[PDB]
Amino acid sequence: STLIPPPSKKQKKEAQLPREVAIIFKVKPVTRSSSAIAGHGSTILCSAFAPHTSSRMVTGAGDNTARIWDCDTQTPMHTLKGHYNWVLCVSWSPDGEVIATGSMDNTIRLWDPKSGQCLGDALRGHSKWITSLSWEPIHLVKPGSKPRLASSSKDGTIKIWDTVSRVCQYTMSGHTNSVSCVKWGGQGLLYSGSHDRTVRVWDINSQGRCINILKSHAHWVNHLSLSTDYALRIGAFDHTGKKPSTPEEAQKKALENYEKICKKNGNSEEMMVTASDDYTMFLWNPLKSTKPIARMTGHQKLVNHVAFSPDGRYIVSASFDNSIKLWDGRDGKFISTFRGHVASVYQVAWSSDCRLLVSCSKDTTLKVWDVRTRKLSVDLPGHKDEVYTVDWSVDGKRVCSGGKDKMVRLWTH
Amino acid sequence: SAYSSRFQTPFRRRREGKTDYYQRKRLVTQHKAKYNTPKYRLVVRFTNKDIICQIISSTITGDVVLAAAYSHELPRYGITHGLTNWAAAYATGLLIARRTLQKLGLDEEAVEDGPRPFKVFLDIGLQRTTTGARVFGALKGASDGGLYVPHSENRFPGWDFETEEIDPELLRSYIFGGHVSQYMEELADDDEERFSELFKGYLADDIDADSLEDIYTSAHEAIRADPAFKPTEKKFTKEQYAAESKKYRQTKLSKEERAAR
């Protein structure tokens, strides 16, 4: 090993002298690993902590049987079954009353957390494998009604789903290529990326009618994201994790948590961002204008992920150049470039306190950065192969990760 | 008589079977080529109808305990039976872990940032090192309680000696006491008289094999809720016990009663 060169003898003589006397809510960072959890014999493709508690968690994989996990015991809990193809993606409802996942097969299957049994007949209609999912935010939802579940597929069509009737209340085919992702914003206007090098805001309130079509990327859009996505995903589940006493209380708490972040500038205008393969990223304010507020750029290779900070003050994105790049959340201005990964980054998840950002890459050793110091915090080796996915618990008590090693691993302070 | 004079007496702690100095020396006497740091041993022990686990730190005056827990506190958490079993040991380990984590202020010298998550070297003492031992379940419970005790998974129950794989479902069934449920189901169809003898409290309380998992889950939730370590009411004063001991303790005879004889 090439150890750091020993200090010069003059440096030791200087160190011998007296020196440098001068009379003149928070999440604990993860720093340690946990026992591996054996499970289905296939590489994990996705993971998502339960919004209401870190003890529950679920992960997809190449095995058809999704496996919920009891993080407190690091043991399998009520393994899911029914799919006949790979579980390409998984997502929890913001209320937490129902789970949703997207199989490589066209079928989609809601699940009940209390037992893991499938919630009715599998959703169907897509001509190609599911790409992403986005539950409707609870604050938009009226009390006493289950949130709608957005869906997307490689064909590029999107079909809003009514979870109660298990039927597609709406459908669209405005994208000529695959929809890389979709998200349900809190303003009531849908947004989604596409492989056709185009983005199209949609107004679900107007029977799904389209209203705008962005067109600035030189290459296909990837991983569309919004500053409000954290509040829209957590479902008004504060870090304490207490369940609201009534559904109307849940609606009020969700509207309050959304207004707290939407009005950071004194006005309700959530920021939006869209990663692209052209080594560029663009801030977006679709309600304000059809053109980007700024053209973020600098990565030497295609960005693989983007994630707004929970407060929205900062933007960050994974890249194939092995150097995550922070950006300002208000204007997209460059801040600092993280480094250390030996291989292309895949995805990252912001800490609930916003002071840290867990990350993973094709290199077996996932890492987490302390954004406040703009420097690496602590490496997290242990995975035997690529860490395809990582996620942070909403309370911050624990972190989970998957990979090609077929050995799920949890992490906590 | 010369044999009594020549031989040197074994150390009184060695004269007891409760300790083995050869292991305690390595447990305490760090080399210590690594940079010096404070260290504490997570002592663990077992006894009939009871379990004991406590953190400890070396001192010139003798070992000092930073925290302690016992199986007898389990019923307050709803574990009214099975205190000696594997799942009860895992529960006692999670209890001591949450208790030390709460007393340490980790949740619910500020310099040299203090979150400094706690770690300890568990010590089973003379208990045999074998896979599936309940002491290993108490260690797994301490590891799940936020304490960070290093340990390979080889000794956890359900381990396959022929491969690195470890079954997690068996570990969950052991943590929940499911082996006791299997023993009860086996007794239900086998000779009933052993069922009438064993688990007499589970039948007197109308306990059933299906409910043991929910009972252990509620006990874990109670351990997560209030690990305050409530002191016993101690109804009688200690002076009353000291007076009661005098009535029967055999005080040494006065010299006046023996020198004359």
Add this chain to the structure above:
Amino acid sequence: LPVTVEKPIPVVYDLGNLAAFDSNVLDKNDLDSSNARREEKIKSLTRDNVQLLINQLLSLPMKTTTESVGGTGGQSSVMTLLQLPDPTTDLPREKPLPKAKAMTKWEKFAAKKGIKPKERAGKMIYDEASGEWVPKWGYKGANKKLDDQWLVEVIDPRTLNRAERKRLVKKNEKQQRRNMKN
């Protein structure tokens, strides 16, 4: 209450031994054994010296490392430790240095000739007329294979080979004892 401390003569510091020395004149009256307060003044002086040392030790740069799981002897990333300068207080050595080196009558001849140190690449060497390597030392040796062969084509020759090996071993031990003599 304030941590600040000062003396007319600045305290000497040796941060490597975690030691400090105070040349300031002691008060003979406070140190008298008869005084009941003698312990208190010495305690206050030791407290002031420890406060000065902590003010010095706390200023030293601290190491940091990202390694946290699987480190053999590395410090935890949450942990931080002072970079102690090497001590300035020389102390007597425990034992004399092992300066009793000897050429053993061979290194001089090697310096006098073109001979070079052995490659030290590995004991293993391929066996002749065989599909598997036979190490020449540290394991089953081909040199001892001659005893195991069913025929030598020539007193038993294997006994002569063992006698030659014992002769070489005794010659090496004799050369070692002769180098021990000098």
Add this chain to the structure above:
Amino acid sequence: NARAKRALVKREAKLVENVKQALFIPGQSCNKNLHDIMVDLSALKKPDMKRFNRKNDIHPFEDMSPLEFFSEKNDCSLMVLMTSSKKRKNNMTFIRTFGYKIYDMIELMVADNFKLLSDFKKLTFTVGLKPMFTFQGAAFDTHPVYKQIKSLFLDFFRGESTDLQDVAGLQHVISMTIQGDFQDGEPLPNVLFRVYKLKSYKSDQGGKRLPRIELVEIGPRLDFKIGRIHTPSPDMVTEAHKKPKQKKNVELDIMGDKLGRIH
């Protein structure tokens, strides 16, 4: 046979010597209070410490051979022979060696006012931490006898010479002070060995990070009286201080470059 090789490597002049072992030697005249003071001093010396239950009649000032023999047999270059007599009451003849040969000797008879560790607050005192030192008085840096006592206490209590140390391990601080200033040619004032447990509190008036320090004595308390003394011969002083020793216009530039200079 390999096990003997490890003992031989331990009994060798390593370029970075391991911390010297201690071997207290109770005397035939030793009083039980002297044995208690010896156990108290040994408790600070752990783990590098040893004991011998057998009583001995060693006379280091009259015959050093037995001490040199025991130092080699026990691999303990340090030694502290307990002794007592009608004149040299509660004698404590500390000893040091270089190569198992005698290096120096000095008497440190305990004062009658000594206090055992048990007669102090029962504060925690983790074993194996390196004590801090806080010498006091100008004579320690000038008087050859006090300089020898300081070097002896440092070699005995400094512990491992680690290149890095946690702040958490500074749980205690050894302390010593001479019994006042003295004019040259006066009898040497008795040394006042002391120990204290460290304490810390928020300052609020001396920096955002520096905490207020406080001390709580734990002992053992002792007030050694100086007596007979012996010093190494100058050739021993030269051999014992030599560095292991294991370049102009050249330096190791940062990043490992060996940049030169023409000047």
Add this chain to the structure above:
Amino acid sequence: QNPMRDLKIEKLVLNISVGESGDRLTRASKVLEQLSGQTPVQSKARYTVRTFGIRRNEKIAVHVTVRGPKAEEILERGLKVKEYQLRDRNFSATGNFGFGIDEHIDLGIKYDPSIGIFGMDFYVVMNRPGARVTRRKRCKGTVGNSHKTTKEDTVSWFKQKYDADVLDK
């Protein structure tokens, strides 16, 4: 009174000290295997005997311990060859006893001619509750004299069942 210290067997230990090394030791072990139902453990020679032609470390004998209710059945089966008449000897002062018998085939099991004729040693060992303290890894200790087994207690247990007589004073 002696409620908690009732006499009871600790274990039965059959043994066969064969007089010569060879394959016959395998059949001698198979005899104990078929008798006790468990695999015999081989016993290597204690040292260089040299008084019978055996060498050190050579196998000479086999034995197998027995416990539980079945041990009493083998005990009675071996006593039947003894005619339920022990000698005044064959009794340890500590409270143990044993005996051997020629022609083990007589004790119940079929002659099985291929196995061949063989005798077998027997040595029962009495014990009392609390004997576990002597062997337990934790809190190991001795036993009190009042609880210690004695030859009189062994003779009393022998008269407690099987109606065995003590022949040859």
Add this chain to the structure above:
RNA sequence: GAGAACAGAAAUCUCCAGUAGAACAAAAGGGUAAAAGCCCCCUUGAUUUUGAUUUUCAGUGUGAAUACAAACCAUGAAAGU
């Protein structure tokens, strides 16, 4: 010491007694006691590089040994070794 078919003073088996005249390469000799002795399970290592000496002459950011120190190794639950 009491004992065990053949089996006795020397076979193998059992119970109570042992500061260990057990086997620890050992020599003056201190000493090893839930081992440094007996039994059982898993395993390479003559691995890589950083410096200070060693002679060389395609003398070479080491081309190779010696010593230094870091990774890597085996084991255990770990301390640690």
Add this chain to the structure above:
RNA sequence: GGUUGCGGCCAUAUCUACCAGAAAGCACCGUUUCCCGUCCGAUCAACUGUAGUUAAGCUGGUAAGAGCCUGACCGAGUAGUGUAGUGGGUGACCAUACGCGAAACUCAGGUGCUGCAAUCU
């Protein structure tokens, strides 16, 4: 004041025969569904506390009991031992001094204290 876990000193702590242990806490104990290992569920591993026992281990008390230990200005600043002087003698060596400085022996005493957490009529 009794007791469990960890300990410090390491025989004032160990060995032999008896007696007591009220209440509380080990232990003995009952079992082989499961993890686990032995020829043997004897030890080890596990099962709940169910049928019991203070009979043992264990805590205390007794003994002209065996060893051990403490301090006394007890031997004693004694014996032993280096030092000077031709002080006596051919001399070895002997009195005179301050140093280092014992032990056998004698006297009196004892047959375990002590820290942390917990518990007990």
